Amino acid sequence: PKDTIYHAKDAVQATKPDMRKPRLVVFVVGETARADHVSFNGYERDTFPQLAKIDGVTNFSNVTSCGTSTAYSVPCMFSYLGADEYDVDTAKYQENVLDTLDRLGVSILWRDNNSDSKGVMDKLPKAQFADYKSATNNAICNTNPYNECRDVGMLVGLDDFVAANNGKDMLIMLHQMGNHGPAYFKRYDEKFAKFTPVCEGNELAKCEHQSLINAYDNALLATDDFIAQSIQWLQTHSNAYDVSMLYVSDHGESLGENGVYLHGMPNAFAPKEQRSVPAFFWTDKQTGITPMATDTVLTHDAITPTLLKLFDVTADKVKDRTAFIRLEHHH
Ligand SMILES: O[C@H]1[C@H](O)[C@@H](O)OC[C@@H]1O
Numbered sequence: 001p002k003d004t005i006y007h008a009k010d011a012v013q014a015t016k017p018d019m020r021k022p023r024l025v026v027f028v029v030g031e032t033a034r035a036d037h038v039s040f041n042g043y044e045r046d047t048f049p050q051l052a053k054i055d056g057v058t059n060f061s062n063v064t065s066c067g068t069s070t071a072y073s074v075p076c077m078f079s080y081l082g083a084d085e086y087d088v089d090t091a092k093y094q095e096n097v098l099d100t101l102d103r104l105g106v107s108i109l110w111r112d113n114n115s116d117s118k119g120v121m122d123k124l125p126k127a128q129f130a131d132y133k134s135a136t137n138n139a140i141c142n143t144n145p146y147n148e149c150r151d152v153g154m155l156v157g158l159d160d161f162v163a164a165n166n167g168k169d170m171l172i173m174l175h176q177m178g179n180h181g182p183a184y185f186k187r188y189d190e191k192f193a194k195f196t197p198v199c200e201g202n203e204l205a206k207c208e209h210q211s212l213i214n215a216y217d218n219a220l221l222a223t224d225d226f227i228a229q230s231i232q233w234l235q236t237h238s239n240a241y242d243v244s245m246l247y248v249s250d251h252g253e254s255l256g257e258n259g260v261y262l263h264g265m266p267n268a269f270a271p272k273e274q275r276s277v278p279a280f281f282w283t284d285k286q287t288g289i290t291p292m293a294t295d296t297v298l299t300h301d302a303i304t305p306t307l308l309k310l311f312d313v314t315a316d317k318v319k320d321r322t323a324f325i326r327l328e329h330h331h
């Protein structure tokens with residue numbers, strides 16, 4: 001082990017949940033989703049029909065990931081250093097934004113249907129991380145012939161966590177399997193097999209290109225559903241809690257442009273498809289949180305200041321950063 005390097009020892013929470021409504025936020029950590037396959041960004045297909053029916057969802061049309069892979073992007077998304085000073089090999093020993101929030105009294109929960117938190121949860125109690133790739137944590141793995149555990153299974157029993165943390169601020173990370181490839185066709189249950197025919201081979205270049213896009217877009221429909229159900233879950237708590245949902249994908253995906261597939265390419269020459277990601281923000285009307293303009297130039301660096309602002313936390317290190325939500329409040 002090594003000593004933790006501090007970045008936000010000045011951090012203070014301006015208000016406490018005994019003096020205003022407690023705050024309950026879900027952060028969906030997405031996977032392999034491309035901004036240009038989002039209906040709201042101009043995609044010809046309605047890949048997000050359920051979110052389109054929910055009042056108060058903001059789509060962000062200009063978000064660039066810090067990197068092109070899970071192990072690289074996820075730690076930077078929760079970092080204080082930002083993409084320009086980020087060092088993947090020492091990120092684990094830096095105070096990160098979850099460390100700050102936990103230290104100031106926010107109850108942190110991380111459920112993972114992807115891999116793990118890539119070091120982000122490592123300093124917090126073991127029980128605050130839960131592996132939802134396991135069929136004995138995730139109750140929703142028998143809805144498909146692959147026996148693949150589904151992201152929506154991470155919503156089961158969250159009410160137990162809320163009850164165990166009654167009246168506290170809470171931040172829940174849900175780490176999605178999402179659009180991970182190459183087997184996009186496995187990523188969604190049959191009710192989302194909307195675009196057809198579907199590539200069901202593992203060698204992507206050998207499928208007809210349209211069938212590859214169809215499988216990828218069907219997987220997006222399942223994520224639309226998962227995010228919508230995450231908002232519906234939050235809404236069952238809106239009387240007692242100020243509830244918000246943030247979604248950001250860890251990176252994009254190549255879909256055969258220039259013959260490139262999957263992701264993980266070094267940033268210097270990775271194509272734009274691997275870095276252009278969707279981001280969504282939803283909040284209940286009574287929270288007073290206001291989203292930034294949909295066309296704000298944004299990156300993964302906006303995540304840490306957003307999470308801090310959602311819990312009324314100020315930290316010098318990110319004082320000049322743009323967030324997904326505004327500093328000005330209408331009364
Ligand atoms: O984005 C990063 C990539 O995912 C990683 O694996 O190598 C460096 C790149 O800059």
Ligand SMILES: [Zn+2]
Nearest residue numbers: 032069070250
């Ligand atoms: Zn990923």
